[PDB]
Amino acid sequence: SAKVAFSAIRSTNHEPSEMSNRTMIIYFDQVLVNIGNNFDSERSTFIAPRKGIYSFNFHVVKVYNRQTIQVSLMLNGWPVISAFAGDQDVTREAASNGVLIQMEKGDRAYLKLERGNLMGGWKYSTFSGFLVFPLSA
């Protein structure tokens, strides 16, 4: 179908899991939207069901931050857009960015922590995206 959208948030303060620490893939436990079930909640990865233009937005919140972090949106292991939050001191900072990208069927989109750490949790972090249109209006 031409109705594809997902939305996930971090509803908890909990520290990252062993696997998350190893893969560095930012996990989102609460999924508000998942039309088409194209977002793999277990892997926190979006798999494009068809060719089209997709929109992604993310806001990774570290309310209890220490040391700077880099969050990147990954497309098949390659970084598209990146964002930075924080000074080596303690603060509350958000890593936000957004982009429109073309995806093929089976293409994988996810967030990876290229730099820094998630100690203190990443509560209030959001990750959403949708199909703008498949591949004039």
58 touches 71 (CB < 8 A):
yes
Buried b (16+ CB within 10 A) or exposed e, 94-131: bbebeeebebeeebebbbbbeebbbeebbebbbbbbbb
118 touches 66 (CB < 8 A):
no
Tell me the sheet residues that pair with 107. none
- Based on its alpha-carbon atoms, the radius of gyration of the chain, rounded to whole angstroms, reads 15
59 touches 125 (CB < 8 A):
yes
Whole-angstrom distance, CA of residue 97 vs CA of residue 119? 21
Chain-centre distance of CA 136, in angstroms?
Answer: 31
The first and second tokens of residue 133, run together, are 């249109």
Dihedral (CA of 135, 42, 93, 128) sign: positive
The first and second tokens of residue 102, run together, are 């073309």
Tell me the sheet residues that pair with 90. 66
Q: What three-state secondary structure class fits 21?
A: helix
CA 102 vs CA 27, 30, 78, 82, 115: distances in Å: 23, 26, 14, 17, 26
Q: What technique solved it?
A: X-ray
Tell me the sheet residues that pair with 84. 70
